[PDB]
Design an enzyme around this catalytic site. Structure first.
Site, PDB file in Angstrom:
ATOM      1  CG  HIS A  47       3.585 -28.810 -22.741  1.00 42.45           C
ATOM      2  ND1 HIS A  47       3.918 -30.052 -22.217  1.00 42.45           N
ATOM      3  CD2 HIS A  47       2.455 -28.993 -23.466  1.00 42.45           C
ATOM      4  CE1 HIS A  47       3.015 -30.937 -22.624  1.00 42.45           C
ATOM      5  NE2 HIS A  47       2.134 -30.321 -23.402  1.00 42.45           N
ATOM      6  CE1 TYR A  63       3.739 -24.752 -30.374  1.00 41.71           C
ATOM      7  CE2 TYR A  63       6.120 -24.407 -30.671  1.00 41.71           C
ATOM      8  CZ  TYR A  63       4.869 -24.779 -31.163  1.00 41.71           C
ATOM      9  OH  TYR A  63       4.717 -25.142 -32.497  1.00 41.71           O
ATOM     10  CB  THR A  64       8.557 -25.372 -22.519  1.00 42.96           C
ATOM     11  OG1 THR A  64       8.118 -26.720 -22.720  1.00 42.96           O
ATOM     12  CG2 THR A  64       8.664 -25.156 -21.012  1.00 42.96           C
ATOM     13  CB  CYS A 221      12.939 -32.730 -24.816  1.00 43.90           C
ATOM     14  SG  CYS A 221      11.556 -32.130 -25.856  1.00 43.90           S
TER      15      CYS A 221
END
Ligand SMILES: Cc1cc2nc3c(=O)[nH]c(=O)nc-3n(C[C@H](O)[C@H](O)[C@H](O)COP(=O)(O)OP(=O)(O)OC[C@H]3O[C@@H](n4cnc5c(N)ncnc54)[C@H](O)[C@@H]3O)c2cc1C
Ligand SMILES: [Cl-]
Ligand SMILES: [Cl-]
Ligand SMILES: [Cl-]
Length: 255
Positions: A47, A63-64, A221
């Site tokens: 990420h 954040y990905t 997740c």
């Protein structure tokens, strides 16, 4: 030319170039790279981190991006859900076009490689879909990656489901390799026909590979209550206990 470089381990600024609404609190954000041929350079599984200065603190969050090097040049693309009392997510939802964000990367202990596992069982809620989507999209786009993926994706109601059409398109690319089930705890509408309720032990046992399968891995997740619940379910189903610090070799890996 990759923009992210572990040898230049600093924050870098990128301007917001486009913003597209997905839901009332979630948008796709396109940030510009310096050259039209640049790629972000984010390895699959990893990420970026975004920093906001708020209330006298540097606050950083993971954040990905939904974009991959192989389909996106000159920019990168993020999905971000903003909260009313959020911090980094609230900053992002206040950006105007042309404003910049400060990012650093890559980061993360999940180093996905082609066929490193035989079968990934994915459990996602809310924005937890982002690390899962990145991996499934990479596998979909790699014509030599045969890894099976079984995803259980749980939310409260219809407006919280993110990336459903994109996910369904990945399934259509490898329909013999990929399986997705959607759960809603409390649908708003009578025309929901997906799963009802939350992700229970029984859901995981039904839809994900068993702990006895060779070279399987479970990826998790989601919000903390979902993570605590599904971790306990995986232990009860005979998976190895997830480690305090999740490492790639672990059978159950929490993002
Ligand atoms: C590996 C990884 C990848 C991620 N990728 C993405 C991504 O691509 N897009 C994305 O939008 N997020 C993603 N997240 C989540 C992201 O890192 C943040 O947790 C989220 O943006 C909230 O950060 P914040 O600084 O705004 O809030 P925080 O400072 O964490 O929390 C402040 C307040 O915001 C509210 N809040 C925060 N999180 C939640 C929540 N989950 N549900 C309800 N209220 C909440 C609460 O009121 C909380 O008290 C990812 C997380 C991880 C670990
Ligand atoms: Cl650092
Ligand atoms: Cl990090
Ligand atoms: Cl393990």
């Amino acid at each position: 030319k990759p923009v992210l470089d572990p040898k230049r381990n600093d924050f870098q600024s990128f301007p917001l170039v486009e913003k597209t609404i997905l839901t009332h609190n979630t948008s796709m954000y396109k940030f510009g790279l310096p050259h039209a041929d640049d790629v972000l350079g984010l390895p699959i599984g990893q990420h970026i981190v975004i920093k906001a200065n708020i209330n006298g603190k540097d606050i950083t969050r993971s954040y990905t991006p939904t974009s991959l090097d192989g389909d996106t040049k000159g920019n990168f693309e993020l999905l971000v859900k903003s909260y009313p009392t959020g911090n980094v997510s609230k900053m992002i939802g206040e950006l105007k076009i042309g404003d910049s964000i400060q990012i650093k990367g890559p980061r993360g202990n999940y180093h996905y490689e082609r066929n490193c596992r035989s079968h990934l069982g994915m459990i996602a809620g809310g924005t937890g879909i982002a690390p899962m989507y990145q991996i499934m999209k990479a596998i979909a786009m790699d014509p030599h990656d045969t890894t099976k993926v079984s995803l259980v994706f749980g939310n409260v109601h219809e407006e919280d489901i993110l990336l459903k059409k994109e996910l369904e398109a990945l399934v259509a690319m490898k329909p013999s390799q990929f399986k997705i089930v959607y759960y809603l705890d409390s649908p708003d509408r009578e025309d929901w026909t997906g799963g009802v309720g939350y992700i229970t032990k029984d859901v995981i046992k039904e839809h994900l590979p068993a702990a006895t399968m060779d070279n399987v891995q479970i990826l998790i997740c989601g919000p903390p209550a979902m993570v605590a619940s599904v971790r306990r379910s995986t232990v009860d189903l005979g998976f190895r206990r997830s480690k305090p610090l999740s490492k790639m070799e672990d059978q159950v890996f929490v993002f």
